[PDB]
């Protein structure tokens, strides 16, 4: 069978970094050359399994997360990193055996008047444990008084990533697609020659 | 949750929404300036109204965090820049009156015309006509008539208006927990909260006074030299022991003496160095000038600039259609968007101003990492200082030879750099006494030392004492001569230029001292020197995060304003001036009277 790598990479719409999209991939044959023949990416720094041995191993489950962030915040998609994206939005485990693919997509994810369809969580009471998804638009109580709905010391958590094509590199949208490779004691499911 | 810990969350949401509302406002302003059209003006006005409303709302919301419970220095600085009451401390009627009077002052300075000569059919506009007629003129009568007509048409209409403006601004400053409007203006050269690096407004006054006192001899010698040259040019118009009339000081305002170089050529047989002919001979486009400037900046050590700087920013005149404004400006839109708005021409002046604005752009990229309220120079005199050191480095003949534009066969003789030093002094050291006099007069007018009923007499007496120029005609009390200045009428601080020069010369001396350069200071070049680039970038990346008394030392080595770099920069010029005015009189006296 053919793994749905193309559908993950070719998706017309991409999720937001706070509500990122996870798609388990299994019961197919790995084809990483197809992944290569997609686009000239901006980052391919992929920790753990080497790209050469990608077509020489058998990873039980493949997780293809996908979201849109800034260019500065791509460097926060890596084990042992800190920031707004690596503490509240999307944290990777220290034992990350997968590949983080992240190209530039300002051509499709910009509207010339503010593409406020992409959000990110900037305030949270506690940090985010690895591979945890939190979507709760509850007003954040920064002050010492109970929150009655916005107003002083009560801020909406999620802040939108106002995207425009005129932004310089680093603030333009970046469709990041990490490709985690989890392994268990179950028989090998994803294998490719 | 401590006050210092809630301050930080408010400040974070300010930072995000404010960055969005500035890239919106700055984009609207750029669209207006590039293409002037009614919808563009409406959009810019809407964006500015939204930005002002957001700033007012955030300033009102930030009053709940007192500065006594704030311990972090950066958070305290951001709150101080955000907790300012501004003009909202006045009554609504008083605030509306102040806004209206400022607006009418601006619109009467901008739209003023001189129809007094002959018939009112020929109304001479200030910008195209008055500047052209004041840049060069061989007739005393026309210069005097134009100067007197402009001064009268300004003062006779803005004297009570300026009195009301002064009263309103003083009341606002007093209600703003300050002493007067001059104190409010000086409240930005102020550091308090860190030991060792601290500053006060009175300390600023004393430092300015001491720097001017130790800079007086050089300006006095230059004034004597230019007075002798004008006496040679103008027969029977100046006194040997008296101050020269003000209206012949090149520009009508007398702020800059650059226009007097034509009559004060040290060596007419040796023409000044020019690159226009060699630049057109090489077929240099508007893109090549910026390409070479970026190459110089990279050679220094500063990084390249993105493709968004090249595709978005416009560098050439767009022709008859799509009218724009030819004011060279370095735009920092707010989110990775850096642009320069200028109509580049094939000239030496445009080539140098390209580097001048490109340095501001480099400063913007350097401090882009800082929070929103700390994305500025540590004071208002840092941006222009960096631009000017860029221009000074780019204008050296050795750099011109290195870039390949100048012929290597060219040789340097003492006349060349002596003329260059004289031009620099006319541009730089000739605007320090005027700036200091104007700022001191405004400070004492706002403070109350100068009585309201006695403005013109004290201003002109200060002009004799400090700048050293007499009145072409006696002036009564129904005049507002300082209001004719753009900065005074538009409520702008003027000490920026004094601070800019006194910082730029220290910066250049420190940078080229670390570049392992042996020789004169005026030939210092930062090109192909990574150490000086790193030393400058260390200060550039700071922005307003740390006090200017520390950022100045981080690149120079001193925590205070200094004149010795300025004095020894013009050292060969100083010795030449000393050797020149031997038999001529030294100094000016106020005893002269018409
Ligand atoms: C994949 O995307 C490219 C452009 O991004 C498009 O040309 C191609 O048709 C897509 N493949 C599909 C829709 O199967
Ligand atoms: C994830 O993607 C699926 C389709 O691939 C969509 O139905 C779902 O709403 C998405 N969820 C989020 C949180 O974006």
Numbering used by the authors:
A (entry chain B): 334 to 482, 484 to 527
B (entry chain A): 19 to 612
Give the published text.
KP.2 and KP.3 carry new F456L/R346T and F456L/Q493E mutations on the viral receptor-binding domain (RBD) of the Spike glycoprotein compared to JN.1, respectively. Mutations observed in these lineages, especially F456L and Q493E, are located on the interface between RBD and human ACE2 (hACE2) and are shown to affect the receptor-binding affinity and substantially escape the Class 1 neutralizing antibodies (NAbs). RBD with ACE2, particularly the synergistic effects of F456L and Q493E, we constructed recombinant subunit proteins of JN.1 + Q493E, KP.2 (JN.1 + R346T + F456L) and KP.3 (JN.1 + F456L + Q493E) RBD and determined the variants’ structures in complex with hACE2 at a resolution of 3.30 Å, 3.30 Å, and 3.29 Å, respectively, using Cryo-EM. Consistent with previous reports on earlier SARS-CoV-2 variants, the interacting residues of the three RBDs with hACE2 are comparable, including Y449, N487, Y489, R498, and T500.
Interestingly, while the F456L mutation minimally perturbs the ACE2 affinity under Q493 in the case of KP.2, a 5- to 10-fold increase of ACE2 binding affinity is observed under E493 for KP.3, demonstrating an epistasis effect between L456 and E493. RBD forms two salt bridges with hACE2 H34 and one with K31. Moreover, Y449 binds to hACE2 D38 and Q42 through three H-bonds, and R498 also forms two H-bonds with D38 and Q42, facilitating a more compact contact. RBD harboring an additional F456L, in contrast to JN.1 + Q493E, the L456 adopts the same rotamer orientation as KP. RBD, allowing space for ACE2 K31 to insert. As a result, E493 forms three salt bridges with ACE2 H34 and K31 and avoids electrostatic clash with ACE2 E35 in parallel. The superimposition of JN.1 onto KP. RBD shows pronounced steric clashes between K31 of ACE2 and F456 of RBD, thereby disturbing the binding mode. Thus, F456L could be a prerequisite for the fitness of Q493E. The intermolecular coordination between the 493 site of RBD and K31 of ACE2 is more stable (and thus stronger) with E493 due to the favorable interaction between explicit charges, which elevates the energetic penalty of enlarging the pocket to encapsulate the larger side chain of Phe.
